[PDB]
Amino acid sequence: MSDFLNQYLLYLIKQYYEKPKANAEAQLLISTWETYADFIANFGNNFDIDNAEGEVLDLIGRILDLSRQVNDVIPASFFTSKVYTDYQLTDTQYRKFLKVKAAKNICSPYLASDEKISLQQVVFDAFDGRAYVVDGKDQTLRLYVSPSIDDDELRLLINLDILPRPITFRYII
Amino acid sequence: MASISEVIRVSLQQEGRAIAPDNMNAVGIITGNQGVLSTADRYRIYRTAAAVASDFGASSQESAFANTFFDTTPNPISAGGVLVIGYWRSASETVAATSATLVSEQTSESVLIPLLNAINDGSFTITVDGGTEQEVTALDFTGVSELSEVATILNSAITGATVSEDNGYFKVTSSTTGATSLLSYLGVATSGTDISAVLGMNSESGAVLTQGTDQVVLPAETKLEGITAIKSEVNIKGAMFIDQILDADIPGIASFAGANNMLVYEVFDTGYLSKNVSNPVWAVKLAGQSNFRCLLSKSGNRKFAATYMARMHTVLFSGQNTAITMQLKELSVTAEEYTDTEIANAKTVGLDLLTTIKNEQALLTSGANDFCDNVYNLEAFRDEIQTNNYNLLKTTSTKIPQTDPGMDTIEDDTEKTCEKYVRNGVFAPGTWTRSDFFGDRQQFVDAIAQKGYYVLIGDLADQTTAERQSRVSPVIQIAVKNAGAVHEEDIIISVNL
Amino acid sequence: MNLIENITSEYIQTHALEFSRGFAVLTLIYEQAVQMWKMNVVYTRAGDEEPQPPIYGVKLALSTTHIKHRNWPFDFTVIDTTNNGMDPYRADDFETGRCQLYFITPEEMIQVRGVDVQ
Amino acid sequence: MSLTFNENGVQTNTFSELRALLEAGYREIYGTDIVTDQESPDGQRINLETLLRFDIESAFSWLYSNLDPDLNTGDMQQIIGKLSGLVLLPASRSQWDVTINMSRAKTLPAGYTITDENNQNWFLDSDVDVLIGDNEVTFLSSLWGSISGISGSSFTQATPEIGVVSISASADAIQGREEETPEQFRLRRQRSTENPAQSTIGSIYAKLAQINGVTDLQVYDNSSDTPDQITGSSNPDILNGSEPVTIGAHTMWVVIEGGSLDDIGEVVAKHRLGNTKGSVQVSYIDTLTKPNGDDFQIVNLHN
Amino acid sequence: LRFDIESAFSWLYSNLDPDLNTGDMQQIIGKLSGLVLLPASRSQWDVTIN
Amino acid sequence: MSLTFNENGVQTNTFSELRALLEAGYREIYGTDIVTDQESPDGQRINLETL
Amino acid sequence: MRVRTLDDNGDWTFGRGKADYITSKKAIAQTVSTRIKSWANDNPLAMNANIDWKDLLGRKGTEDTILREIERVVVQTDGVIRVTELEVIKTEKRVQSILLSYDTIYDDSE
Amino acid sequence: MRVRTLDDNGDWTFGRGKADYITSKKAIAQTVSTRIKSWANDNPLAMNANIDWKDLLGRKGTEDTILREIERVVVQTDGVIRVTELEVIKTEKRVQSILLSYDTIYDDSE
Amino acid sequence: MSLVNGMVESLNNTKSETEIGIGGYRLFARVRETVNYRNIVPTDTLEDGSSSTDDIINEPITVSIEGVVSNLFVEERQYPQLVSRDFSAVGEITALLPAKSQQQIQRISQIDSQIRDAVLAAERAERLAGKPYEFFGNSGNSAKTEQEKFIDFMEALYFSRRPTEVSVNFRDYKNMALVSFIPVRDNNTKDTRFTADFQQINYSTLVYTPVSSPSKSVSGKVSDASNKGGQNPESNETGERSLLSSLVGG
Amino acid sequence: MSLVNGMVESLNNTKSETEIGIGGYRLFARVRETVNYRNIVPTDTLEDGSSSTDDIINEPITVSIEGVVSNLFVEERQYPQLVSRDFSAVGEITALLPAKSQQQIQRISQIDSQIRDAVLAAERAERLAGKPYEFFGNSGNSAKTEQEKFIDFMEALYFSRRPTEVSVNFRDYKNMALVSFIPVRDNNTKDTRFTADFQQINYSTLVYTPVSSPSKSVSGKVSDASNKGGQNPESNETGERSLLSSLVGG
Incomplete structure (x- = not known):
């Protein structure tokens, strides 16, 4: 008997809280409305780039201009829910690409921008904290990464321009 | 810097008003944990949750019970009442060895100092550990402004012991513990004006001289009947136990509740909702132990008693109709589901329930055993007639002569008390339904039917000369009829189809 | 920016904002079953009689244009008179002055959008 | 007017109209004289239903509005921060190390709270065991914000426990990070929209000239890859640059005199993004927050 | 009543889609980046007065 | 109007406006419900400063 | 006035629409019968729904006001005219049972 | 209402801004505690600041007016409701100590 | 209008046993006690002979109470006046409100603690609207005699300018407004003889309201769309704050 | 308006023990003593049924005192009336004023001695504004009997046209204006039986004033910008002094 059902049953006046049929019926109405309440509450939980799978991800792609169609082949995340073609993205990869894309949408050519959001902060929490951007000499943008990301992915992002990049970019291994 | 403060000071109240359990609402909670209330400290009096905490800690269950006590909105301290924590020896109290003490007379600090400041030289004879008699022949008390200073002087004077002052008392404790007699009550010295008698330490003076008890002493493990020790010290009028009274001991305490003109509240769990003889609560009901109030809590939530107690003993027995029933009154504990x-x-056995209707407490009280209303109110009435007769025998400078005008005095005072408790809502006029009386049945029944109470005192010439020179007043017989309160309503609709 | 006065704690209230470039009807709604302040406007341009299509149900929130996309020369931004930048959520949250709503003048939308509008 | 969700928004149906609708219904189903008052079963339920729909419509307007990236409170962390690339740094409780001096060995309870001299409650997180003497144990704040725990204060216990003799903090309390305020989170998201106040050549000059302590500074940049040319500056005289100059390959170069050195490094890291020519090296230090409450140090070195 | 609310849910999620939004919700989803619809602009007209 | 010293002279800021300014300040620094009356330390000092 | 009938124990009835509804003279009976039973500060939608029980059965000396409030509730009912009510037992244990008789708007057609 | 806390001896407190401020139910306590202490014709900015002490402790026969003025000051305080105050000692030397008890606007939430 | 309405709302004010006095101050004695039901019946002979009735316009009942207040009043038989309950959270309906993080919750907690200090007084006032006595409360100070208490309570009620409830025997009228309060002090009796005329503030509901009197928790929830007048915000000065720096750019 | 204001400013007039009389003339006997709290409650049934309250307009309290004045009044138990202090220099704040030479200072001293003689009377009057008795003062002449003193004080108060403070037992109302004073002299008693009705002059502050009542030393200092009407100086005759000879040239 969760919060919603309990607080609503108080609107049953006390002639009818205890008669079993009446209480069951009021609980029926409250329950049917309660599934909507739960849906509204869990929309946030189940919508964002993290807890999103399948179509919502695709929706996010089309809101951040990144379809699961990268036309490239990446090896499989062999650690069922959904399968795509080989030349598309399994969900988790496409999730975290969409995170990177969301970052690069709000980029800026500053590594510690105090007024606007920097490049460094947004690329760093793009990768959830496994990236590190330091500039170069001929406007190189050296980029350290944790070893928990295969070279295939990052070389693909650089080869599709999804990482944040003002004019020039590169990586490091 | 001459502050404003020396023409006005405004601070926060510090001591808990330091009152004593005089009225009816002096309710108790009996612990069994020898944390701070050891023997000879059998009780402590409180009027706020925080003080109980500071002596007991918000962690110990005793502070929890105090919290659920004071949380009742019309709690006892709102009608001239106190909470008191008792102590029954649950298991093998170890009383640490003490040192001999010497508590002096209550000195007002407005008279001790003016008398001291004239006493140039000092003069004491004290003895510690029965050693050589010590005589103190120089105590320049002239420069003293408060008892703390004379305390310091005595501390510097009495070798082998420490002197402290505390609430106008002078305590003197030897350092050594165990067979450490302070033989002296500050006897007269050979020379120097005597400070002993004026202080109050003097042997003829009313100075307690508890000798140093022997080394560590083990009191045994008492029984819950050790409540008597609390009752013989506090004049508790309603008590509970933190630990649940064993079945085999319920009748005893139940009898106790009647015999000491008090109430005892005890809760039982679901397994006692029968009416067999073996069920202790029904044994109480058959035995007529109407003062041993039984309460019901499905979970076993003991605190239900305290709040219940904290809800009952809450009537100022001086305003009109302040006598309250119990049913449907807010408590400080979550109800249960039955x-x-x-x-x-539970209704038909004697237990009481705080049951949910809808997230809203509903106290339902039984009438199997006599209603808590009736028992508590009758206790208040016996206590109040006792108090009024005592106050009459105390007030007068003369002796209240053993003449018929004297009996009319006493009977009028008893009638005044009865009239107060009819104006108080407890007793109301009605047709006396019982089949017994005191004097003229017509006189008796008419008085009950028109005033609600009757007070007849037998004349002097109707008592033996053995009961005449015993300076005992004749038997005073008073009869009352409880007011007719209502608890439910069976509204019957008259059908016309 | 000028303060729209006379906002009370009663849940569904209407204020007719009469200003230079036409007038609007600020319907302040207080959703309590979930604490927020919805807003509705029907801004009718001074040059005609049929109002522009309404806005319905936007929150009031601190330091932010609310109706900018509907592209008419005013909007509302509320600010919190504490520094606890919490959006208006109590029913009385405007009468006591905890948060207050500001009506942006059209001449000030000029400074915001950088261009005029209808 | 009633609930309509269109190109105009979400008009939520008011209570009175909603119940009137339900009552007109019930009249149409059953009869025009149905008694629908506080008592009648139909009355009870029409009231229950109208309340349920009013509240659900409110919750639906909550959903609709808190899908707005410029207006949101609790899924604002959710709907935009992880969708527009931001993060709401979680708050923290300021850990305080305190010596509690103890007479009788004990297990101090799960959440007993002491209070420092400025009415701030520091509650012990979990049950601790204290021994015969002094005990260094860690209290966490009750305010989730940044709670300045001065060293050397007097503590009075809000939830007294028998035995304490002396609460005393030898050293101060490391503060707890407070959240970006919803107002400040929205403002930080929004600031990314508007164009910079200056051109990128002049942005550094503008925001490197309010450095309290400087009196003059100039900037020479090399936008084109031509190594030793000049393609802009803050000096109007350099339109032709009749002299040679050593400047790096596609770099920018600043000369200041009399500047707060660390502040200069901070500004250059704030607006350069690239190679800086110079002789003296100066850096910014910034903290980057891993999703778990850690701190990663970054040094941005310019010249 | 209940299906009114649920079809509102269906419409809401239908309007989390840049390729189907078609309304105010299109601009709400359009504020997710700092751009809004361009405003109508008065036409300019340079003339010679004398 | 408040203290301004220009090619027009020296407009001196009146008492009520000055204290209102200081009060609006203290509200902005501390909180909108700060009690600033004759007693409160803040009230005492706001009065002292405005004077 | 129609109103859904309640069965013996007083729970609700669904099904047989337009037939589980009490017609009249019994609809008044049901509606008075459970208007009496409506505690006052219960319903958040009618906080003065009917007479206040938690504050009348929990206080000594309200029998007259119980009766006056029952007469108030009954008389202010759509369909009743008069009342004739008093107390028949005297708290046989401590529960008093009162007898309430009222003349509906029916049975006055002569 | 906020107000800067004062330490034990009652001097002011600076530092810990927004934290040396008393929140409530204690802000009322502090504000009554030192509203009592505000002599009347002291403050040139409030010459009827609070009750007049130089003209009430310097004249015989004002105890009733001391008490009435203390009740006036306390009751006219933002946050208090009632009072319950009287004199507890009787000028133990010549200083009388009165006991003042008031119900703040808090602790009435039931 | 209807003859049925008569008995219906004639019993709508039932006198509780507790016998509220002039609003809870029963500590005087009622020397005399009157009510004045008046009516305006238009005079000239009504027009039709068939249906031109419904012409007895009602009037505001006045209630006059003259009594005496002494230093020592001993009340004979009346039940205690008990503090009315705070039944505000009866329908309070949370748990649909959003999930928001800590110190986002607690920020709301501080805001609530911050304006409860400024609203709870008037909230209690409206909770205790009819009865001012237990709002003002027993004076509680031993210096003020009983006539002190009667005068200061009467002045508080009079300056309060809020209607009170007044009980004549057999009726506790709900919204009486203090019209005239004349206390008199002869020079042959230390008591105060006071005459107080109250006038009922009767007001009915014009508009469709399904709920008669709801909780505070739903009182605004069921409120219909309230209306305020227009105003020209572009022409306000008392709050002409500049445009926020975060907006000029945007 | 608010119910809270009631008790707050009901106690705002506390009667001092000294028992000011009709303003300090307590040397009579109060045969009767009444106050009249009145109210205007608009009559017709109020419009809404939800919030259309706040309709009890207050009224000026009147206070009627009828008493007798004899040649020889013996007052039973009342404390002396002591002269109120001259707390004008409490905030007087010099030492920022300029350094100016001697006989530039002393010229100011002569100007001050020159117009103190013309202002100090009204300054004392405003210092003693409420209480006229110790302004007019005890008559001090042995020729005038006590009824002389009562009549000439009453005429001085009446012609004074300044409000006085009047004490009914338990209240010393602060600004009473003498409305009616009727002294009567029967031909069977040499005393004077007088009835005096006063009416309170209650007036609140419309405008923002941070300081309630300051010293004279800062009363003008904290005053807001006062406003006087226009006038046409070019069209004045009563002071059309010529142009100073020092200006025509310059």
């Missing part, structure tokens, strides 16, 4: 069969059994 079936209809079990709630009916």
Whole structure:
């Protein structure tokens, strides 16, 4: 008997809280409305780039201009829910690409921008904290990464321009 | 810097008003944990949750019970009442060895100092550990402004012991513990004006001289009947136990409740909703132990008693109709959920329930045993007639002569008390339904029917000369009829189809 | 920016904002079953009679244009008179002055959008 | 007017109209004289239903509005921060190390709270065991914000426990990070929209000239890859640059005199993004927050 | 009543889609980046007065 | 109007406006419900400063 | 006035629409019968729904006001005219049972 | 209402801004505690600041007016409701100590 | 209008046993006690002979109470006046409100603690609207005699300018407004003889309201769309704050 | 308006023990003593049924005192009336004023001695504004009997046209204006039986004033910008002094 059902049953006046049929019926109405309440509450939980799978991800792609169609082949995340073609993205990869894309949408050519959001902060929490951007000499943008990301992915992002990049970019291994 | 403060100071109240359990609402909670209330400290008096905490800690269950006590909105301290924590020896109290003490007379600090400041030289004879008699022949008390200073002087004077002052008392404790007699009550010295008698330490003076008890002493493990020790010290009028009274001991305490003109509240769990003889609560009901109030809590939530106690003893017995029933009154504990069969059994056995209707407390009280209203109110009435007769025998400078005008005095005072408790809502006029009386049945029944109470005192010439020179007043017989309160309503609709 | 006065704690209230470039009807709604302040406007341009299509149900929130996309020369931004930048959520949250709503003048939308509008 | 969700928004149906609708219904189903008052079963339920729909419509307007990236409170962390690339740094409780001096060995309870001299409650997180003497144990704040725990204060216990003799903090309390305020989170998201106040050549000059302590500074940049040319500056005289100059390959170069050195490094890291020519090296230090409450140090070195 | 609310849910999620939004919700989803619809602009007209 | 010293002279800021300014300040620094009356330390000092 | 009938124990009835509804003279009976039973500060939608029980059965000396409030509730009912009510037992244990008789708007057609 | 806390001896407190401020139910306590202490014709900015002490402790026969003025000051305080105050000692030397008890606007939430 | 309405709302004010006095101050004695039901019946002979009735316009009942207040009043038989309950959270309906993080919750907690200090007084006032006595409360100070208490309570009620409830025997009228309060002090009796005329503030509901009197928790929830007048915000000065720096750019 | 204001400013007039009389003339006997709290409650049934309250307009309290004045009044138990202090220099704040030479200072001293003689009377009057008795003062002449003193004080108060403070037992109302004073002299008693009705002059502050009542030393200092009407100086005759000879040239 969760919060919603309990607080609503108080609107049953006390002639009818205890008669079993009446209480069951009021609980029926409250329950049917309660599934909507739960849906509204869990929309946030189940919508964002993290807890999103399948179509919502695709929706996010089309809101951040990144379809699961990268036309490239990446090896499989062999650690069922959904399968795509080989030349598309399994969900988790496409999730975290969409995170990177969301970052690069709000980029800026500053590594510690105090007024606007920097490049460094947004690329760093793009990768959830496994990236590190330091500039170069001929406007190189050296980029350290944790070893928990295969070279295939990052070389693909650089080869599709999804990482944040003002004019020039590169990586490091 | 001459501050404003020396023409006005404004601070926060510090001591808990330091009152004593005089009225009816002096309710108790009996612990069994020898944390701070050891023997000879059998009780402590409180009027706020925080003080109980500071002596007991918000962690110990005793502070928890105090918290659920004071949280009742019309709690006892709102009608001239106190909470008191008792102590029954649950298991093998170890009383640490003490040192001999010497508590002096209550000195007002407005008279001790003016008398001291004239006493140039000092003069004491004290003895510690029965050693050589020590005589103190120089105490320049001239420069003293408060008892703390004379305390310091005595501390510097009495070798082998420490002197402290505390609430106008002078305590003197030897350092050594165990067979450490302070033989002296500050006897007269050979020379120097005597400070001993004026202080109050003097042997003829009313100075307590508890000798140093022997080394560590083990009191045994008492029984819950050790409540008597609390009752013989506090004049508690309603008590509970933190630990649940064993079945085998319920009748005893139950009898106790009647014999000491008090109430005892005890809660039982679901397994006691029967009416067999073996069920202790029904044994109480058959035995007539109407003062041993039984309460019901499905979970076993003991605190239900305290709040219940904290809800009952809450009537200022001086305003009009302040006598309250119990049913449907807000408590400080979450109600429980009961079936209809079990709630009916509780009604018909004597238990009491704080049951949910809808997130809203409903206290339902039984009448199997006499209603808590009736028992508590009758206790208040016996206590109040006792108090008024005592105050009459105390007030007068003369002796209240053993003449018929004297009996009319006493009977009028008793009638005044009865009239107060009819104006108080407890007793109301009605047709006396019982089949017994005191004097003229017509006189008796008419007085009950028109005033609500009757007070007849037998004349002097109707007592033996053995009961005449015993300076005992004749038997005073008073009869009352409880007011007719209502608890339910069976509204019957007159059918016309 | 000028303060729209006379906002009370009663849940569904209407204020007719009469200003230079037409007038609007600020319907302040207080959703309590979930604490927020919805807003509705029907801004009718001074040059005609049929109002522009309404806005319905936007929150009031601190330091932010609310109706900018509907592209008419005013909007509302509320600010919190504490520094606890919490959006208006109590029913009385405007009468006591905890948060207050500001009506942006059209001449000030000029400074915001950088261009005029209808 | 009633609930309509269109190109105009979400008009939520008011209570009175909603119940009137339900009552007109019930009249149409059953009869025009149905008694629908506080008592009648139909009355009870029409009231229950109208309340349920009013509240659900409110919750639906909550959903609709808190899908707005410029207006949101609790899924604002959710709907935009992880969708527009931001993060709401979680708050923290300021850990305080305190010596509690103890007479009788004990297990101090799960959440007993002491209070420092400025009415701030520091509650012990979990049950601790204290021994015969002094005990260094860690209290966490009750305010989730940044709670300045001065060293050397007097503590009075809000939830007294028998035995304490002396609460005393030898050293101060490391503060707890407070959240970006919803107002400040929205403002930080929004600031990314508007164009910079200056051109990128002049942005550094503008925001490197309010450095309290400087009196003059100039900037020479090399936008084109031509190594030793000049393609812009803050000096109007350099339109032709009749002299040679050593400047790096596609770099920018600043000369200041009399500047707060660390502040200069901070500004250059704030607006350069690239190679800086110079002789003296100066850096910014910034903290980057891993999703778990850690701190990663970054040094941005310019010249 | 209940299906009114649920179809509102269906419409809401239908309007989390840049390729189907078609309304105010299109601009709400359009504020997710700092751009809004361009405003109508008065036409300019340079003339010679004398 | 408040203290301004220009090619027009020296407009001196009146008492009520000055204290209102200081009060609006203290509200902005501390909180909108700060009690600033004759007693409160803040009230005492706001009065002292405005004077 | 129609109103859904309640069965013996007083729970609700669904099904047989337009037939589980009490017609009249019994609809008044049901509606008075459970208007009496409506505690006052219960319903958040009618906080003065009917007479206040938690504050009348929990206080000594309200029998007259119980009766006056029952007469108030009954008389202010759509369909009743008069009342004739008093107390028949005297708290046989401590529960008093009162007898309430009222003349509906029916049975006055002569 | 906020107000800067004062330490034990009652001097002011600076530092810990927004934290040396008393929140409530204690802000009322502090504000009554030192509203009592505000002599009347002291403050040139409030010459009827609070009750007049130089003209009430310097004249015989004002105890009733001391008490009435203390009740006036306390009751006219933002946050208090009632009072319950009287004199507890009787000028133990010549200083009388009165006991003042008031119900703040808090602790009435039931 | 209807003859049925008569008995219906004639019993709508039932006198509780507790016998509220002039609003809870029963500590005087009622020397005399009157009510004045008046009516305006238009005079000239009504027009039709068939249906031109419904012409007895009602009037505001006045209630006059003259009594005496002494230093020592001993009340004979009346039940205690008990503090009315705070039944505000009866329908309070949370748990649909959003999930928001800590110190986002607690920020709301501080805001609530911050304006409860400024609203709870008037909230209690409206909770205790009819009865001012237990709002003002027993004076509680031993210096003020009983006539002190009667005068200061009467002045508080009079300056309060809020209607009170007044009980004549057999009726506790709900919204009486203090019209005239004349206390008199002869030079042959230390008591105060006071005459107080109250006038009922009767007001009915014009508009469709399904709920008669709801909780505070739903009172605004069921409120219909309230209306305020227009105003020209572009022409306000008392709050002409500049445009926020975060907006000029945007 | 608010119910809270009631008790707050009901106690705002506390009667001092000294028992000011009709303003300090307590040397009579109060045969009767009444106050009249009145109210205007608009009559017709109020419009809404939800919030259309706040309709009890207050009224000026009147206070009627009828008493007798004899040649020889013996007052039973009342404390002396002591002269109120001259707390004008409490905030007087010099030492920022300029350094100016001697006989530039002393010229100011002569100007001050020159117009103190013309202002100090009204300054004392405003210092003693409420209480006229110790302004007019005890008559001090042995020729005038006590009824002389009562009549000439009453005429001085009446012609004074300044409000006085009047004490009914338990209240010393602060600004009473003498409305009616009727002294009567029967031909069977040499005393004077007088009835005096006063009416309170209650007036609140419309405008923002941070300081309630300051010293004279800062009363003008904290005053807001006062406003006087226009006038046409070019069209004045009563002071059309010529142009100073020092200006025509310059």
